[PDB]
Protein backbone atom coordinates (compact mmCIF):
# COMPACT_ATOMS: atom_id res chain seq x y z
CA UNK A 1 0.00 0.00 0.00
CA UNK A 2 1.13 3.55 -0.64
CA UNK A 3 1.19 5.52 2.67
CA UNK A 4 -0.15 9.04 3.37
CA UNK A 5 3.32 10.41 4.08
CA UNK A 6 4.53 8.86 0.81
CA UNK A 7 1.59 10.39 -1.07
CA UNK A 8 2.47 13.68 0.56
CA UNK A 9 6.08 13.44 -0.62
CA UNK A 10 4.94 12.86 -4.25
CA UNK A 11 2.57 15.80 -4.19
CA UNK A 12 5.35 18.03 -2.82
CA UNK A 13 7.88 16.91 -5.48
CA UNK A 14 5.48 17.24 -8.41
CA UNK A 15 4.52 20.76 -7.37
CA UNK A 16 8.12 21.81 -6.65
CA UNK A 17 9.02 20.67 -10.18
CA UNK A 18 6.10 22.56 -11.80
CA UNK A 19 7.35 25.71 -9.96
CA UNK A 20 10.97 25.15 -11.05
CA UNK A 21 10.33 23.80 -14.55
CA UNK A 22 8.61 25.84 -17.21
CA UNK A 23 7.73 23.84 -20.33
CA UNK A 24 7.27 27.15 -22.21
CA UNK A 25 10.98 27.99 -21.71
CA UNK A 26 9.95 31.67 -21.82
CA UNK A 27 13.05 32.85 -19.91
CA UNK A 28 15.34 31.49 -22.59
CA UNK A 29 15.11 34.87 -24.29
CA UNK A 30 16.96 36.42 -21.34
CA UNK A 31 20.06 34.41 -22.30
CA UNK A 32 22.84 35.63 -24.58
CA UNK A 33 21.74 34.83 -28.15
CA UNK A 34 22.91 31.46 -29.55
CA UNK A 35 25.31 31.44 -32.52
CA UNK A 36 25.35 28.74 -35.23
CA UNK A 37 32.73 28.17 -29.45
CA UNK A 38 29.77 29.97 -30.98
CA UNK A 39 27.22 28.28 -28.68
CA UNK A 40 29.11 28.73 -25.41
CA UNK A 41 27.69 32.09 -24.28
CA UNK A 42 24.12 30.89 -24.86
CA UNK A 43 24.56 27.44 -23.36
CA UNK A 44 26.57 28.65 -20.33
CA UNK A 45 23.60 30.91 -19.53
CA UNK A 46 21.14 28.05 -19.89
CA UNK A 47 23.18 25.93 -17.47
CA UNK A 48 23.44 28.88 -15.05
CA UNK A 49 19.67 29.30 -15.23
CA UNK A 50 19.22 25.52 -14.85
CA UNK A 51 21.42 25.50 -11.76
CA UNK A 52 19.15 28.11 -10.11
CA UNK A 53 16.05 26.09 -10.98
CA UNK A 54 17.60 22.94 -9.60
CA UNK A 55 18.40 24.69 -6.32
CA UNK A 56 14.76 25.89 -6.06
CA UNK A 57 13.62 22.28 -6.57
CA UNK A 58 16.11 20.95 -4.03
CA UNK A 59 14.81 23.28 -1.25
CA UNK A 60 11.32 21.87 -1.64
CA UNK A 61 12.48 18.22 -1.07
CA UNK A 62 11.17 16.96 2.23
CA UNK A 63 13.93 16.59 4.81
CA UNK A 64 16.37 18.70 2.73
CA UNK A 65 16.00 21.74 5.05
CA UNK A 66 17.01 19.63 8.09
CA UNK A 67 20.49 19.27 6.60
CA UNK A 68 23.27 21.73 7.52
CA UNK A 69 23.78 24.41 4.90
CA UNK A 70 27.24 23.01 4.23
CA UNK A 71 25.73 19.63 3.48
CA UNK A 72 23.17 21.44 1.31
CA UNK A 73 26.04 23.07 -0.57
CA UNK A 74 28.00 19.86 -1.12
CA UNK A 75 24.96 17.97 -2.49
CA UNK A 76 24.01 20.73 -4.90
CA UNK A 77 27.49 21.29 -6.28
CA UNK A 78 28.07 17.59 -7.01
CA UNK A 79 24.53 16.86 -8.32
CA UNK A 80 23.87 19.99 -10.32
CA UNK A 81 25.03 18.79 -13.74
CA UNK A 82 23.40 15.38 -13.14
CA UNK A 83 20.04 16.90 -12.26
CA UNK A 84 20.28 19.26 -15.19
CA UNK A 85 20.92 16.23 -17.46
CA UNK A 86 17.95 14.38 -15.87
CA UNK A 87 15.67 17.45 -16.16
CA UNK A 88 16.75 17.96 -19.75
CA UNK A 89 15.06 14.68 -20.66
CA UNK A 90 11.82 16.57 -20.74
CA UNK A 91 12.97 18.78 -23.65
CA UNK A 92 14.98 15.90 -25.23
CA UNK A 93 13.33 14.38 -28.26
CA UNK A 94 14.06 10.99 -29.79
CA UNK A 95 12.80 12.18 -33.19
CA UNK A 96 15.86 14.35 -33.96
CA UNK A 97 18.17 13.24 -31.06
CA UNK A 98 18.06 16.82 -29.80
CA UNK A 99 16.68 18.95 -26.98
CA UNK A 100 13.68 20.92 -28.20
CA UNK A 101 12.76 24.00 -26.20
CA UNK A 102 9.81 25.20 -28.32
CA UNK A 103 11.65 27.15 -31.04
CA UNK A 104 14.31 26.48 -33.68
CA UNK A 105 16.72 28.92 -32.03
CA UNK A 106 16.27 27.16 -28.66
CA UNK A 107 16.41 23.64 -30.15
CA UNK A 108 19.77 22.04 -29.31
CA UNK A 109 21.73 19.41 -31.25
CA UNK A 110 25.02 17.55 -30.85
CA UNK A 111 26.74 20.07 -33.10
CA UNK A 112 25.43 22.87 -30.86
CA UNK A 113 26.70 21.14 -27.70
CA UNK A 114 29.94 20.53 -29.55
CA UNK A 115 29.88 24.16 -30.65
CA UNK A 116 30.39 25.13 -27.00
CA UNK A 117 33.45 23.29 -25.67
CA UNK A 118 32.33 19.66 -25.33
CA UNK A 119 33.93 16.54 -26.89
CA UNK A 120 31.98 13.56 -28.23
CA UNK A 121 33.51 11.62 -25.35
CA UNK A 122 30.99 13.40 -23.18
CA UNK A 123 28.34 13.93 -25.87
CA UNK A 124 28.02 10.39 -27.27
CA UNK A 125 27.48 8.83 -23.81
CA UNK A 126 25.07 11.70 -22.88
CA UNK A 127 22.85 11.14 -25.93
CA UNK A 128 22.82 7.40 -25.09
CA UNK A 129 21.66 8.34 -21.57
CA UNK A 130 18.80 10.52 -22.80
CA UNK A 131 17.60 7.74 -25.15
CA UNK A 132 17.75 5.13 -22.40
CA UNK A 133 16.03 7.38 -19.87
CA UNK A 134 13.35 8.31 -22.47
CA UNK A 135 12.72 4.60 -23.14
CA UNK A 136 11.82 4.20 -19.46
CA UNK A 137 8.70 6.30 -20.11
CA UNK A 138 8.61 7.35 -16.48
CA UNK A 139 5.54 8.78 -14.74
CA UNK A 140 6.15 12.41 -13.81
CA UNK A 141 6.10 11.23 -10.22
CA UNK A 142 8.95 8.85 -11.00
CA UNK A 143 10.96 11.48 -12.83
CA UNK A 144 10.59 13.96 -9.96
CA UNK A 145 11.54 11.33 -7.37
CA UNK A 146 14.66 10.35 -9.33
CA UNK A 147 15.86 13.95 -9.42
CA UNK A 148 15.34 14.25 -5.67
CA UNK A 149 17.06 10.93 -4.93
CA UNK A 150 19.94 12.03 -7.15
CA UNK A 151 20.33 15.33 -5.24
CA UNK A 152 20.29 13.65 -1.82
CA UNK A 153 23.08 11.13 -2.13
CA UNK A 154 24.94 9.93 0.92
CA UNK A 155 28.19 9.13 -0.93
CA UNK A 156 28.99 12.49 -2.45
CA UNK A 157 32.51 13.61 -1.50
CA UNK A 158 32.62 16.18 1.30
CA UNK A 159 29.42 15.02 2.99
CA UNK A 160 29.41 15.73 6.75
CA UNK A 161 26.26 13.89 7.85
CA UNK A 162 25.71 10.88 5.60
CA UNK A 163 23.58 9.16 8.25
CA UNK A 164 20.98 11.95 7.89
CA UNK A 165 21.47 12.30 4.14
CA UNK A 166 20.91 8.49 3.69
CA UNK A 167 17.83 8.59 5.93
CA UNK A 168 16.34 11.35 3.76
CA UNK A 169 17.29 9.46 0.58
CA UNK A 170 15.88 6.18 1.92
CA UNK A 171 12.44 7.73 2.44
CA UNK A 172 12.48 9.00 -1.15
CA UNK A 173 13.70 5.65 -2.51
CA UNK A 174 11.06 3.70 -0.49
CA UNK A 175 8.43 6.03 -1.88
CA UNK A 176 9.63 5.39 -5.42
CA UNK A 177 9.83 1.60 -4.92
CA UNK A 178 6.33 1.53 -3.39
CA UNK A 179 4.95 3.87 -6.10
CA UNK A 180 6.22 1.63 -8.94
CA UNK A 181 4.60 -1.47 -7.36
CA UNK A 182 1.27 0.26 -6.46
CA UNK A 183 0.81 2.71 -9.35
CA UNK A 184 3.04 1.34 -12.16
CA UNK A 185 1.53 -1.40 -14.36
CA UNK A 186 3.51 -4.19 -16.08
CA UNK A 187 5.31 -4.57 -18.35
CA UNK A 188 6.71 -1.03 -17.95
CA UNK A 189 7.12 -1.77 -14.28
CA UNK A 190 9.53 -4.63 -14.97
CA UNK A 191 12.92 -4.04 -13.37
CA UNK A 192 11.93 -0.32 -13.35
CA UNK A 193 13.56 0.61 -10.01
CA UNK A 194 16.86 -1.11 -10.75
CA UNK A 195 16.95 0.55 -14.19
CA UNK A 196 16.35 3.95 -12.61
CA UNK A 197 19.17 3.37 -10.14
CA UNK A 198 21.39 2.30 -13.03
CA UNK A 199 20.71 5.72 -14.56
CA UNK A 200 22.17 7.28 -11.42
CA UNK A 201 25.32 5.29 -12.05
CA UNK A 202 25.34 6.53 -15.64
CA UNK A 203 25.07 10.07 -14.24
CA UNK A 204 28.21 9.69 -12.06
CA UNK A 205 30.25 8.78 -15.09
CA UNK A 206 28.70 11.59 -17.13
CA UNK A 207 29.46 13.94 -14.27
CA UNK A 208 33.11 12.89 -14.13
CA UNK A 209 33.58 13.36 -17.87
CA UNK A 210 31.96 16.81 -17.55
CA UNK A 211 34.38 17.74 -14.75
CA UNK A 212 37.47 16.92 -16.89
CA UNK A 213 36.00 18.69 -19.98
CA UNK A 214 34.87 21.73 -18.03
CA UNK A 215 38.34 21.97 -16.48
CA UNK A 216 40.01 21.95 -19.90
CA UNK A 217 37.64 24.68 -21.05
CA UNK A 218 38.15 26.43 -17.71
CA UNK A 219 41.94 26.56 -18.01
CA UNK A 220 41.88 28.99 -20.94
CA UNK A 221 41.08 32.41 -19.35
CA UNK A 222 39.19 33.78 -22.44
CA UNK A 223 36.81 30.84 -22.47
CA UNK A 224 36.29 31.22 -18.74
CA UNK A 225 35.14 34.86 -19.34
CA UNK A 226 32.25 33.54 -21.39
CA UNK A 227 30.71 31.78 -18.40
CA UNK A 228 28.40 33.18 -15.69
CA UNK A 229 29.76 33.72 -12.17
CA UNK A 230 27.30 31.15 -10.75
CA UNK A 231 28.62 28.55 -13.24
CA UNK A 232 32.19 29.37 -12.12
CA UNK A 233 31.30 28.95 -8.43
CA UNK A 234 29.56 25.55 -8.78
CA UNK A 235 31.23 23.59 -11.63
CA UNK A 236 34.39 25.73 -11.29
CA UNK A 237 34.32 25.33 -7.46
Amino acid sequence: KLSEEQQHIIAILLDAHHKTYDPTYADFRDFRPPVRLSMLPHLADLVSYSIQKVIGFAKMIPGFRDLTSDDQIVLLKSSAIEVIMLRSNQSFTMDDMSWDCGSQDYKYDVTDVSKAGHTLELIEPLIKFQVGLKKLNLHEEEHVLLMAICIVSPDRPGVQDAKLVEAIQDRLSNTLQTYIRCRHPPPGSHQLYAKMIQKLADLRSLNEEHSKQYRSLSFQPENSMKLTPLVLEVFGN
Binding site: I55, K59, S69, L76, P229
Partner: peptide, 11 residues
Protein backbone atom coordinates in the same frame (compact mmCIF):
# COMPACT_ATOMS: atom_id res chain seq x y z
CA UNK B 1 33.54 27.78 1.86
CA UNK B 2 33.96 30.33 -0.94
CA UNK B 3 30.36 29.64 -2.13
CA UNK B 4 28.67 33.00 -1.68
CA UNK B 5 25.96 32.83 -4.42
CA UNK B 6 25.03 29.17 -3.92
CA UNK B 7 24.66 29.71 -0.16
CA UNK B 8 22.41 32.74 -0.75
CA UNK B 9 20.12 30.80 -3.14
CA UNK B 10 19.98 27.90 -0.67
CA UNK B 11 18.63 30.14 2.09
Amino acid sequence: KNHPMLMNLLK
